Amino acid sequence: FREVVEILDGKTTIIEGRITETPQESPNPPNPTGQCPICRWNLKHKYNYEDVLLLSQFIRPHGGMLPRRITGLCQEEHLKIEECVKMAHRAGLLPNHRPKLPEGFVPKSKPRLNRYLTRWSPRSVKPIYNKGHRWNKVRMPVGSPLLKDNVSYSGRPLLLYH
Template sequence: DVLLLSQFIRSDGGMLPRRVTGLCLEEHKKVAVCVQMAHRAGLLPNHRPPLPEGHIPKKPKLNRYLTRWPVRSAKPIWKRGPKWCKKPFTVGHPLLKDNVKYTQKPLCLNH
């Protein structure tokens, strides 16, 4: 939830420290990963200064959540192989694998 994540972000876009939020180390890392994923997906406002006029960014703007971005990478995945033998790639983050599940369905982190 973006409103929940925005409580842990400073006005300049950085994370609030643990002593301010009162979270344990494990939960603080999980929140930091979720904030990073929300920034990548474009769900949180961008707190960086605006680019100069005429500058074209190298990264494409994707308005998709958890797609085309592998774990721990800044490069998008463009091709996964032919239609009949596509290679699955992991989405999400390894820290979030042990999160609470409310369904019987197993957690699938491949896309």
């Protein structure tokens, strides 16, 4: 992990890069012959939005994401990680990875609405005024189609649109 430090000492600017010790991979994966990091740790079709401990591994401290060339993931599972990180961020998980702006925390707004399993964004969804009957129903999506491939212990499919 490399950090940059910018120093101002009397009309002289010094920009330096310093290496900080980084954590390493755990020594014994259960499936060593797998290429991809999730698919060698056997977390394919297992994790969800609730798994905070794995979604914290592939994120920036400011809530951003890391590219797939760095993370090494397969493309579909990288998209699944991206969707689950977005779902957790709108669900109110990862509270310490928001950026710090001390002028803005003091002017409080209306209290944060508790929500989870949000496929879309709060600001871009129109309210369904017209709705519909049973033979044409506008269904509110809950969860994402990227996560329909998870295992079902009940055996019933995950109802994504309700």
